[PDB]
Amino acid sequence: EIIPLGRLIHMVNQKKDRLLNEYLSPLDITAAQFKVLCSIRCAACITPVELKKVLSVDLGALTRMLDRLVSKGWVERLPNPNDKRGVLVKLTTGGAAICEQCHQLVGQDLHQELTKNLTADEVATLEYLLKKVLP
Amino acid sequence: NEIIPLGRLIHMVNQKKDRLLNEYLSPLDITAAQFKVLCSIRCAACITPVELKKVLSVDLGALTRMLDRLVSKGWVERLPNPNDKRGVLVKLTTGGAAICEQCHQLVGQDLHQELTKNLTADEVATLEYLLKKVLP
Known part of the structure; x- marks a missing residue:
């Protein structure tokens, strides 16, 4: 049973995500949705583009997700002081609290x-x- | 020298892997997402888009478009499902099989x-x- 490092890391990651979805179940939030909240939480504010790079997921699905999380009252869109055409997504008080609960639970x-x-x-x-x- | 939990470490090392994967694949004009698709189609000889969406945990919209792109490249061909008639079975072409192998060697x-x-x-x-x- 010789298995290359790259694939082992992938498999162990997927398993981690399965378990994430399981342990996050009580808060009605997927692992995908959770990773988003965390990424937004690490940077005070972040743009969908900059968030797409960090997360490595499709921009379209991420934009729909960002709108799901806005309905939940977890994420708000501030207009970018720099761009004024792009938006800065950040966590709400509710989002920050829900995100910390997720951490505490998982x-x-x-x-x-x-x-x-x-x-x-x-x-x-x-x-x-x-x-x-x-490194 | 700070205690980072196993969960987050695996994420960071995986994310690093995915970035390096995108690098070593640019010279062959095929993305990391495109590459994962070919590998999954390779592993299951024939597979439904539905069943493939499950294996990759991606959006069916993005996948159907990505499947369309790979059909253009002549790496993936659609066969009509003998069991369904409303679905398709995608599989690899000889060309797509070669490229998938060649990417696995190169990376x-x-x-x-x-x-x-x-x-x-x-x-x-x-x-x-x-x-x-x-x-386990």
């Missing part, structure tokens, strides 16, 4: 599920070596 | 080399071993 359990087949010893090594791939 | 080596740049071979071995453990 965080510990997802990690605990992903790492059930591993020792805390092996967990440390895995985190360490994944860190080495990043 | 198969280099993506790996680039990802494992800062890693010993023993560390890479250890890394793959522990990732596999997360999958």
